[PDB]
């Protein structure tokens, strides 16, 4: 199904997959927190200027 | 509508940053803005959710092929 490749990895290519994945998992989550970070600071600087001027 | 979240908001966040500071954000009462805001947050824990459900199912996969050879 969506793994399929698998099937044609060595049994030690399963190993190194199976190594990595957790940092692998963390870069990820890390790329993402930065990316909505930046996204909120337009929003969150407006906020902050309403409550500024009122 | 049930917890609406405008297209162009999804457009946004997928985006890069070059076209930000053309947000004319001023425009809008501070509660639509706090909505805005609220919103972005659950994209990201929708994509979290993704990322997440993934490498369960990818980890799953490797498993089950290790005991298959075995
Ligand atoms: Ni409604």
């Given at each position: 199904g969506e793994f399929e490749f698998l099937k044609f990895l060595t049994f030690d290519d399963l190993n190194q997959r199976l190594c990595n994945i957790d940092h692998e998992m963390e870069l990820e989550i890390e790329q993402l927190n930065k990316k909505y970070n930046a996204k909120r600071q337009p929003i969150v600087d407006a906020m902050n200027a309403k409550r500024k001027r009122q | 509508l049930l917890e609406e979240i405008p297209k162009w908001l999804a457009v946004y966040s997928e985006?890069?940053?070059?076209?930000?500071?053309?947000?004319?954000?001023?425009?809008?009462?501070l509660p639509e803005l706090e909505g805005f805001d609220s919103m972005l947050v659950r994209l990201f824990k929708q994509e979290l959710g993704t990322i997440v459900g993934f490498y369960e199912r990818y980890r799953r996969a490797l498993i089950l092929e290790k005991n298959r050879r075995a």
């Open positions: - | 985006a890069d940053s070059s076209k930000d500071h053309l947000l004319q954000f001023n425009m809008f009462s």
